[PDB]
Amino acid sequence: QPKALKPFSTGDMNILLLENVNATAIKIFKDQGYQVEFHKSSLPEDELIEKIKDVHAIGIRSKTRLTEKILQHARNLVCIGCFCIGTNQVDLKYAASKGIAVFNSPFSNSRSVAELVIGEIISLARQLGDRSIELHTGTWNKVAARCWEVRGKTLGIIGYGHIGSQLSVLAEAMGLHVLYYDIVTIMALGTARQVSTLDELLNKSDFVTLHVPATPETEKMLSAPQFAAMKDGAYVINASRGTVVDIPSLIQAVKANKIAGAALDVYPHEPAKNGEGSFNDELNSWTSELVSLPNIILTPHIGGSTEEAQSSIGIEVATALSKYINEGNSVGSVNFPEVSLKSLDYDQENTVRVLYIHRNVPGVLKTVNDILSDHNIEKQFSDSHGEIAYLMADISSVNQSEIKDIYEKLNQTSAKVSIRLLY
Amino acid sequence: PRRVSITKQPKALKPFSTGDMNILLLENVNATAIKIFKDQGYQVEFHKSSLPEDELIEKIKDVHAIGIRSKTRLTEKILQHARNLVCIGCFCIGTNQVDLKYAASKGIAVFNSPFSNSRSVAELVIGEIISLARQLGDRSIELHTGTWNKVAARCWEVRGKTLGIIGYGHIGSQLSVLAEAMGLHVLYYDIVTIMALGTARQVSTLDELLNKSDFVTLHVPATPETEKMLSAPQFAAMKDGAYVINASRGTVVDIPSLIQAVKANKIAGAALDVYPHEPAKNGEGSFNDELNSWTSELVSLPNIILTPHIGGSTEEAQSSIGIEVATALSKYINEGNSVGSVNFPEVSLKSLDYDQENTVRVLYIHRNVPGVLKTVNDILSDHNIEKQFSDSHGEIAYLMADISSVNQSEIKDIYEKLNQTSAKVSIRLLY
Amino acid sequence: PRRVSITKQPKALKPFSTGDMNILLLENVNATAIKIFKDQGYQVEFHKSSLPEDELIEKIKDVHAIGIRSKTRLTEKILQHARNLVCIGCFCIGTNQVDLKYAASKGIAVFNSPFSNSRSVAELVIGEIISLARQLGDRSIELHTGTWNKVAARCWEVRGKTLGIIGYGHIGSQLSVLAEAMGLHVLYYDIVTIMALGTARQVSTLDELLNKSDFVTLHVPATPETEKMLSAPQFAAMKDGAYVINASRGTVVDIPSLIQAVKANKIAGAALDVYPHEPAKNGEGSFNDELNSWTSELVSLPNIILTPHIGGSTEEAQSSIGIEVATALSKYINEGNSVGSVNFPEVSLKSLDYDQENTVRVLYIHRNVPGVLKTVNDILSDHNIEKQFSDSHGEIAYLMADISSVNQSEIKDIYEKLNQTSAKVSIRLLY
Amino acid sequence: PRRVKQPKALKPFSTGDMNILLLENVNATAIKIFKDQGYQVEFHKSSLPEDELIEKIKDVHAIGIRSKTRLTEKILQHARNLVCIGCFCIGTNQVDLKYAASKGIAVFNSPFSNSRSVAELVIGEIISLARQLGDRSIELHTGTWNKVAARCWEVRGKTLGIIGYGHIGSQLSVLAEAMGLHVLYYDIVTIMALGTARQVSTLDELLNKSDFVTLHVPATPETEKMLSAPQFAAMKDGAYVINASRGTVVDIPSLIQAVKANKIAGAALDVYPHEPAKNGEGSFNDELNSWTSELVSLPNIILTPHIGGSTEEAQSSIGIEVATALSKYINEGNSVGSVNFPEVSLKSLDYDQENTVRVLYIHRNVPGVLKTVNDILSDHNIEKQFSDSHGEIAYLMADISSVNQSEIKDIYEKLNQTSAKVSIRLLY
Ligand SMILES: NC(=O)c1ccc[n+]([C@@H]2O[C@H](COP(=O)([O-])OP(=O)(O)OC[C@H]3O[C@@H](n4cnc5c(N)ncnc54)[C@H](O)[C@@H]3O)[C@@H](O)[C@H]2O)c1
Ligand SMILES: NC(=O)c1ccc[n+]([C@@H]2O[C@H](COP(=O)([O-])OP(=O)(O)OC[C@H]3O[C@@H](n4cnc5c(N)ncnc54)[C@H](O)[C@@H]3O)[C@@H](O)[C@H]2O)c1
Ligand SMILES: NC(=O)c1ccc[n+]([C@@H]2O[C@H](COP(=O)([O-])OP(=O)(O)OC[C@H]3O[C@@H](n4cnc5c(N)ncnc54)[C@H](O)[C@@H]3O)[C@@H](O)[C@H]2O)c1
Ligand SMILES: NC(=O)c1ccc[n+]([C@@H]2O[C@H](COP(=O)([O-])OP(=O)(O)OC[C@H]3O[C@@H](n4cnc5c(N)ncnc54)[C@H](O)[C@@H]3O)[C@@H](O)[C@H]2O)c1
């Protein structure tokens, strides 16, 4: 059985959710007794600074920029939830220096990207995109030439991680052979086979799919030589990062009848907001040329744009913020020492949890364990991350009177960054 | 279990009183058929399109087997001139383009490929389940015209959703296995009880399927009972925001009712491969209100996938069609095998051992009237009948017999005696 | 997938000029056979043992079908007295106890159950693979005599080991899927190329299987090439501490060599179900040096499992035999269907629709000489032959014909004429 | 899926050579793992007499035992240098765990390493009982040829009743279905079924509908003799009972009656209420268990000397599991998975983290101890620290950053002089 913990003082917890986090997060926060403010869009800096001064936790996504300019006004902010993969929109170092833990959902889009690729393998192999554009404009063009059953073909997976490995099992289920290249040796799932070099994957694959991070080594890793290494009439699918494919080379290989089709979800330059005129030659010089090619599927970075994906994002990040607020748990934080302890058995009464964010300088634990020396330390865990560190301690026989004293002593320590007490 | 049969070599048979076999293939049959036909020693004439009635009438008088597809119409008008035509291959599903009854009355067996498109249609629906669930068609049309529209609202991971398969036959049962592999629950309705594949579950009524499914797929034949079988009432029984896929027959969905359910936000997306009226040839401007009154309206709707009846348009499907029907025609010509014919008694016999020399196979198509076997087994009475099989299909019947100890002299005599019988429709001897 | 076959119900047929059918079942065939026969309206006489030659000759004179197993000897001596015997069922694999040639010359079709024991032998081997791997036989023998001997040395988890299957037939292929399911690697040697089940791999030579296998199991027929195919040379090619299982034939393993390889600690354990010489009846002292010289030495060895040829000794196996052979005889009695007969031309026709009234099925077993079908189709010439099939097997042949519009009066004439023909061996009409 | 800076291997501060004592014939994988660290290993195939053990344990740093060796306060009181105890088996009752803990000795075991071996064992015995193979082979070894098909079964189509759907049971489930069994399972908690197995609400439903009943439950007061007459009467005529769990779960007298009354057709027993401590003849008799000679007289009963986990693979996995655990506790502070000890560990240190020392502080769970320790360490940066308590003892692991050779000896003596100290080790 578990022991629910409360925060000494503070009053009700205030959550600010921006950019339309999924309702699963809203339900979780409300079920904690938190007060939730929800917005479907981001906020202008003025409205955001005003709303953030008294907020305890903020949930954002890709567009909201939490810089020092806005975080300096965050008086009560305990943690930040990024309900997405990227954390670049948050000044992680500054947030850490003020004891604000930041969380994300890194792998919540794996299934959605994998299902996307399965659909696009089939669409490219059958030219569904072109056929449907044709009928929507009156053209009847029944084509069986060079249209393929996906059964029996070979899928080349570049990057056999979270997405690649799930795509592997789906591809075999559809009857594909799976070859994968990766810069590390990975145990294959099902009947997939890893190949030593990229060129072997390119030579032997009918479908080439990219699921790699953005690194200097992945920058334009598929260009003219790599397209030349592929099979005549093979297919390229890129739902990874916009830098991984050299688009001019792809346009050339397609225009030269070397590549039979392509599906692009990511681009070197992408619009900051949705709009009618946003995808054009000013954004990417080759756009008007890319748009003129047959059997290219273009998607506005929708690799993770599903209800389920956002629902999983909601649960992971809301649960994470909930465990950090209610317990202290920082595991999985992107800028913060990863610290946690087993929850309390409910019957362990008069037990208090000390959450002490401080500077990573000698003597701090000396000070803190002195302050706590009149009580039995049941459990203690302290870890450091750069110039900050984080201490969790469970103390045994503490009554209401001595919580104020233990708290006020810790709040007066020289190395303190942030202190919370949990009942 | 599958093993290389290490028994006695078969005795390849050659037709009596004939020259080289002439095959006419129309409408761009796949190369797998041409290879099989040439490997039989046949003489193959190949055309990418059909033939006009005049040019076809002259060409068919000396043809032994004709290969067609959907467009070539082999009516009594043109078949009257087929003096040497042994069999007709339809390298497609439909046989309506052939006068099957007349072809039978002249002893011409017809073969088709009914189920060669199963895999291609099944994968088609999988891609379309995903495309509709993710709105791929709309997103991609948007980018080709400059519009950037990242949307996650009511775009779905397909895992955990329910596929409603209406018609659990060759395509449906194969779609079932693919669907579960993609993580869907599969429900199927059919007018017959069928053993489910994997963990699919058959439902008693159509409405139960419609109420419980997220994706509804049609894989039914064209019958009076399937005519517009999904219409306004059935869309009302479906889930809010459900998806309709029809890659079966163009009459099975009432399109005006579908358009209405889409405009009323009841149906979230639809994928149509077949239509009440379809063009006869590819071309621009072919798909419009003159073909189907509601086209301009259907085209204006969001998240609708429209395909020009490409459910079986794959290299593999056409390759299997080529192999299936060419093998069928070849075995009927070279052996006598009529199993799988659409207009003809289904008759065959085990091949003869290489060492069964001087054995001849009689292929005797005749009228289904008493006394014929009396005549035939009389004519054959000086030889031992090794095997014999005769079966009837309406007014015609077909006799295969293997008779032993036959020399060249006795082949001409047996042939003309059988060729002189009153009940004869067509006679071939295989030596 | 399996479907509710929607066709017209069949027209159950009853023999002309005969009364109730008399079935004689000997040697304790399973009750599933008795049930099927009684449900046909047949009269069933059942015995737990065979019959002495005197009682058998008298009882067989008026019996229509006889069911036997291994011990009943149906020779010419006793079959010459069988006036009404239409068919013989062997509810086992072996048919040597039946004079197949003589029975055929008198028009008596024989059926058996060749493969009904496949599942039982496969499960037997799985259980023995584990028992040999864990020395279960010994451990349990040990405690039954007071000895406590917990041993992990050289006892193995079966997961990860390699099973060598010699003979990848009915039993072997079923053993393959069970073995992989138990986590085994499967290699198989066979004199034929066979497509492997699951992820099994066929090896080119027997020695490759022997070198690479942890468990070697034999599932081969008895042939000159299989006699003693595992002896000292083959044991020398196996792995140190490998295992031999023989549930095939008593000739395939050289037991003195196996005893030699075990005593040299080369073979770690063995499971034997079959032996060069086996007792005729169950009893103590029956398995000894007089039966096989090496018995007393074989029993002295550790971790050898010995079973009294119980490979097919399950309720299910005997039940499947009951279903198989009783169904086979029933279809041959009720419909003429001789497919699967071991001594007889294999002949059958699609059954007739309930409504096809006045349709008669002619069953004509005869001598394989020219002119017979001339005669028969003469006799039937006043009626339309709907279907006819005749095949030959050595000196006999078998004619099935369905003839249309036949009344009670003209059935007796057709029968008496056919009964008078010179080539007749046996004639039955089904009405 | 599984995928391919190196850690800074730590050495105990100024100590001697490591001494490992391995008893009861532990698998060679444990010996190999220990020697690869340079440890000194003494190996024995059997246990040791109490006299020889007391002398040998005085100077040993780590001991590996199994079920028979009893490490009581009598023998552990002489353990001067004993840091940890490895139980290369499941049971730990043969060790006085509290006494070991009060002296700062962590104890480790291998709880689930035998799952596969017991599961395959039951498969073999399901088949052996379904065919009464044991009897047939005993018969031929004494000359009797008795070909029987009556009441012998193909296992396909039958129902396996798994009682206790835990590590072994769940693994048995998939194997049973692969063999063609229908699987029903009873357990006091709702558990997600593997494959197509189905949980039954009550034990009686499992007994009524199963052909083969197998027990995979812990030894608790609720399982004590849980299958007795009332249960056997609820089973099908000619059903089979397999017990490879604990010797108390089956009421053997009721089973003998059910076999004698032809109600139960066969049984396979691997565990027993009383079992010998060592292998030998005559050890399994009426003096050990009153009903032994009568149980042995029954047809189609498989008896095995507790060999459910007696496979090379299982013992190799036990060897790897426990030796790794003991090695990580010695070479690092890692006590996760110990049966008597606070579970404490920290991420290992990067090769490049020079002059870093790891403090391992066993102590009494009383207030003020951490006050003392972080004072002693206050001149150095605490990179990481973790302390947890377990009853009367507690265990502190700490990484300190800038420490030279001079400053280690002082840190050691200070911690070694503390009032609450039970055991202190420093890793350099
Ligand atoms: N389109 C979308 O909406 C969307 C959604 C989620 C993720 N993504 C992106 O897709 C990519 C894959 O995500 P994931 O979670 O599967 O990643 P991951 O970190 O789990 O796996 C990436 C794999 O790529 C391999 N790799 C790295 N560099 C490589 C190189 N140069 N060549 C070959 N292999 C290399 C790594 O070893 C690893 O196995 C990431 O870049 C992620 O940001 C896109
Ligand atoms: N789009 C294409 O290019 C393409 C290609 C091949 C086939 N098809 C068409 O798809 C359909 C399915 O082909 P198939 O080979 O799977 O057919 P099939 O004959 O194997 O199976 C059809 C199933 O529908 C069931 N059924 C019949 N009437 C029904 C009714 N009223 N309600 C419900 N179920 C009913 C039948 O019992 C059967 O199981 C056919 O009409 C075929 O022409 C289309
Ligand atoms: N022990 C029993 O009670 C019992 C029960 C049933 C069957 N059997 C016996 O088991 C054997 C197997 O039965 P089955 O139905 O599986 O047979 P099967 O006919 O299905 O298969 C036998 C296989 O052995 C192969 N083979 C033949 N000669 C070979 C050789 N020299 N080397 C390697 N492979 C060779 C064949 O190619 C074939 O694949 C038979 O002898 C049968 O009598 C025993
Ligand atoms: N024979 C051997 O050599 C050997 C080897 C290993 C384990 N075992 C024994 O086998 C048993 C199973 O081991 P495991 O590792 O799978 O155990 P486990 O702890 O993983 O699972 C036991 C299961 O039994 C259930 N259970 C407990 N009490 C129950 C009751 N009264 N009724 C029904 N279900 C009940 C529990 O819920 C649990 O699901 C243990 O007792 C273990 O000691 C014996």
Rounded distance, CA C209 to CA A109, Å? 47
**Smallest CA–CA separation between A184 and chain D, in Å?**
6
Query: String of b and e for A145-177 (b: at least 16 CB within 10 Å)?
Result: eebbbbbebbbbbbbbbbbbbbbbbbbbbbebb
* CB pair distance less than 8 Å for C136 and D146: no
Q: Is the beta carbon of B417 within 6 A of some atom in ligand 2?
A: no
- For chain B, how big is the Rg over CA atoms in Å? 26
Q: Which of C430, C431, C400, C429 is nearest to C417 (CA)?
A: C429
Distance (angstroms) between ligand 3 centre and the Cα of B352 equals 28
* CB pair distance less than 8 Å for A384 and D387: no
Q: Which two tokens stand for residue D96?
A: 């006085």
Catalytic residue among A45, A68, A149, A270, which? Answer: A270
Where are any strands of DSSP class E within A18-73?
A: 35-38, 57-60
Which chain A positions have a beta carbon within 8 Å of B134's beta carbon?
Answer: 115-116, 119, 302, 305-306
Dmax (CA) of chain A: 85
**Smallest CA–CA separation between A274 and chain B, in Å?**
5
- For chain C, how big is the Rg over CA atoms in Å? 26
Helices then strands, each counted (H, E), chain D: 14, 16
**Smallest CA–CA separation between C189 and chain D, in Å?**
24
Whole-number Cα distances in Å, B130 to A114, A178, B158: 11, 20, 7
User: Do B390 and B373 contact (CB within 8 A), yes or no?
Assistant: yes
User: How would you classify the pairing of strands B215-218 and B242-246?
Assistant: parallel
Closest ligand to residue D308's CA: 4
Is the CB of residue D220 less than 8 Å away from at least one CB of chain A?
no
Rounded distance, CA C428 to CA B387, Å? 20
Instruction: Spell out the residues 6+ positions from residue A46 whose beta carbon is closer than 8 angstroms to its own.
Output: none
DSSP 3-state of B389: strand
Rounded distance, CA C219 to CA C171, Å? 7
Distance (angstroms) between ligand 3 centre and the Cα of C175 equals 12
Rounded distance, CA B209 to CA B166, Å? 8
Burial environment of residue A400 by CB neighbours within 10 A (0 to 12, 13 to 18, 19 or more): exposed
Is the CB of residue B370 less than 8 Å away from at least one CB of chain C?
yes
User: How would you classify the pairing of strands A416-422 and A352-359?
Assistant: antiparallel
Q: Find residues 96-135 of chain B whose CB sits inside 8 Å of chain A.
A: 119-120, 123-124, 126-128, 130-131, 133-134
* CB pair distance less than 8 Å for A115 and B148: no
**Smallest CA–CA separation between D143 and chain C, in Å?**
4
Rounded distance, CA D254 to CA D230, Å? 9
Distance (angstroms) between ligand 4 centre and the Cα of D230 equals 22
C70-74 contact pairs (CB < 8 A, 24+): C70/C27, C70/C94, C70/C97, C71/C27, C71/C97, C72/C26, C72/C27, C72/C97, C73/C97, C74/C98, C74/C99, C74/C103
Choose the closest CB to B377 out of C4, C369, C374: C374
Mutation target among C136, C163, C255, C278 for the D interface, most CBs of D within 10 A: C136
Q: Which of B140, B164, B254, B167 is nearest to B215 (CA)?
A: B164
User: Do B379 and B418 contact (CB within 8 A), yes or no?
Assistant: yes
One-letter amino acid of A118 = I
Rounded distance, CA A58 to CA A7, Å? 18
Is the CB of residue A196 less than 8 Å away from at least one CB of chain D?
no
Residue A394: closest CA among chain D residues belongs to which residue? Answer: D388
Rounded distance, CA A230 to CA A237, Å? 13
Q: Which two tokens stand for residue B111?
A: 């073969």
Q: Which two tokens stand for residue D8?
A: 């800074």
Rounded distance, CA B346 to CA B339, Å? 4
Burial environment of residue B266 by CB neighbours within 10 A (0 to 12, 13 to 18, 19 or more): middle
DSSP 3-state of D220: coil
| CA terminus-to-terminus distance, chain C | 34
Q: Which of A414, A397, A305 is nearest to A62 (CA)?
A: A305
Q: If residue D90 lies in a helix (H) or strand (E), which one and from where to where?
A: none
Q: Is the beta carbon of B228 within 6 A of some atom in ligand 2?
A: no
Asked if B157 is an active-site residue, the reply is: no
User: Do A285 and A246 contact (CB within 8 A), yes or no?
Assistant: no
3-state secondary structure chain C: CCECCCCCCECCCCECCCCCCEEEECCCCCHHHHHHHHHCCCEEEECCCCCCHHHHHHHHCCCCEEEECCCCCECHHHHCCCCCCCEEEECCCCCCCECHHHHHHCCCEEECCCCCCHHHHHHHHHHHHHHHHHCHHHHHHHHCCCCECCCCCCCCCCCCCEEEEECCCHHHHHHHHHHHHCCCEEEEECCCCECCCCCCEECCCHHHHHHHCCEEEECCCCCCCCCCCECHHHHHCCCCCEEEEECCCCCCECHHHHHHHHHCCCEEEEEECCCCCCCCCCECCCCCCCCCCCHHHHCCCCCEEECCCCCCCCHHHHHHHHHHHHHHHHHHHHHCCCCCECCCCCCCCCCCECCCCCCEEEEEEEECCCCHHHHHHHHCCCCCEEEEEEEEECCEEEEEEEECCCCHHHHHHHHHHHHCCCCEEEEEEEC
Of C219, C249, C320, the residue with max ligand 3 atoms within 8 A of its CB, to mutate for a pocket test, comes to C219
Instruction: Spell out the residues 6+ positions from residue A411 whose beta carbon is closer than 8 angstroms to its own.
Output: A419
Distance (angstroms) between ligand 2 centre and the Cα of B392 equals 28
Which chain B positions have a beta carbon within 8 Å of A274's beta carbon?
Answer: 148-150
Asked if A301 is an active-site residue, the reply is: yes
**Smallest CA–CA separation between C234 and chain D, in Å?**
25
Q: Which two tokens stand for residue B88?
A: 């007709």
Handedness of CA D60, D66, D70, D72 (dihedral sign): positive
* CB pair distance less than 8 Å for D374 and A365: yes
Q: Residue written as tokens 């308590």? A: D389
- For chain D, how big is the Rg over CA atoms in Å? 26
Rounded distance, CA C407 to CA C431, Å? 10
For chain A, the residue count is: 423
Rounded distance, CA C184 to CA C177, Å? 9
Instruction: Spell out the residues 6+ positions from residue C83 whose beta carbon is closer than 8 angstroms to its own.
Output: C61, C62
Q: Is the beta carbon of D270 within 6 A of some atom in ligand 4?
A: yes
Rounded distance, CA A327 to CA A340, Å? 8
How many CB pairs below 8 Å do chains A and B form together?
A: 201
Rounded distance, CA C275 to CA C305, Å? 13
User: Do D176 and D170 contact (CB within 8 A), yes or no?
Assistant: no
What single string gives the DSSP state of each residue in D249-302? SB-HHHHHHHHHTTSEEEEEE---SS--SS-BTT-SSTTT-TTHHHHTTSTTEE
Rounded distance, CA D401 to CA D377, Å? 10
Rounded distance, CA C137 to CA D153, Å? 19
Nearest atom in ligand 2 to B221's CA: 41
* CB pair distance less than 8 Å for C307 and D133: yes
Q: Alpha-carbon dihedral of residues A322, A328, A331, A333, nearest 10 degrees? A: 70
Residue A139: closest CA among chain B residues belongs to which residue? Answer: B284
Domains of chain D by start residue, with CATH:
5-114+311-339 (3.40.50.720), 115-303 (3.40.50.720), 354-428 (3.30.70.260)
B3 phi, psi to nearest 5 deg: -140, 155
Residue nearest to atom 19 of ligand 2 (CA): B169
* Side-by-side strand order, sheet with B22-25: B43-46, B22-25, B65-68, B87-90, B109-111
D418 phi, psi to nearest 5 deg: -70, 150
Distance (angstroms) between ligand 2 centre and the Cα of B115 equals 10
Is the CB of residue D282 less than 8 Å away from at least one CB of chain C?
yes
Nearest atom in ligand 4 to D186's CA: 33
Bridge partners (DSSP) listed for residue C78? none
Residue B388: closest CA among chain C residues belongs to which residue? Answer: C390
Q: Is the beta carbon of D116 within 6 A of some atom in ligand 4?
A: no
**Alpha carbon D138 to its chain's center:** 33
Is the CB of residue C279 less than 8 Å away from at least one CB of chain D?
yes
User: Do A383 and A337 contact (CB within 8 A), yes or no?
Assistant: yes
- Alpha-helical (H) ranges within D62-166 are 73-76, 97-102, 115-131, 133-140
- For B211: left if phi > 0, alpha if psi spans -120 to 50, otherwise beta; the answer is alpha
Residue nearest to atom 39 of ligand 2 (CA): B169
Dmax (CA) of chain B: 86
Q: Residue written as tokens 């099908």? A: D236
Query: String of b and e for A304-327 (b: at least 16 CB within 10 Å)?
Result: bbbbbbbbbbbbbbbebbbbbbbb
User: Do B392 and B345 contact (CB within 8 A), yes or no?
Assistant: yes
Is the CB of residue A369 less than 8 Å away from at least one CB of chain D?
yes
* CB pair distance less than 8 Å for B284 and A138: yes
Degrees to nearest 5, angle at CA A123 with A121 and A126: 105
Q: Which two tokens stand for residue C25?
A: 């079942």
User: Do D214 and D228 contact (CB within 8 A), yes or no?
Assistant: no
Degrees to nearest 5, angle at CA C286 with C282 and C288: 150
How many CB pairs below 8 Å do chains A and D form together?
A: 82
- Alpha-helical (H) ranges within B205-269 are 206-212, 232-237, 255-263
- Alpha-helical (H) ranges within A127-245 are 128-135, 162-173, 198-204, 224-228
* CB pair distance less than 8 Å for C195 and B392: no
User: Do A58 and A70 contact (CB within 8 A), yes or no?
Assistant: no
Distance (angstroms) between ligand 4 centre and the Cα of D119 equals 12
Of B92, B168, B190, the residue with max ligand 2 atoms within 8 A of its CB, to mutate for a pocket test, comes to B190
Q: Is the beta carbon of D268 within 6 A of some atom in ligand 4?
A: no
Instruction: Spell out the residues 6+ positions from residue C280 whose beta carbon is closer than 8 angstroms to its own.
Output: none
Q: Is the beta carbon of B121 within 6 A of some atom in ligand 2?
A: yes
User: How would you classify the pairing of strands B109-111 and B162-166?
Assistant: unpaired
Neighbours of D391 (CB within 10 A): 12
* Side-by-side strand order, sheet with C304-306: C201-202, C185-189, C162-166, C215-218, C242-246, C267-272, C304-306
Residue nearest to atom 3 of ligand 2 (CA): B311
Q: If residue A318 lies in a helix (H) or strand (E), which one and from where to where?
A: helix A307-326
DSSP 3-state of D226: coil
Q: Is the beta carbon of D247 within 6 A of some atom in ligand 4?
A: no
Asked if A338 is an active-site residue, the reply is: no
* Side-by-side strand order, sheet with A79-82: A35-38, A14-17, A57-60, A79-82, A101-103
Rounded distance, CA B111 to CA C248, Å? 46
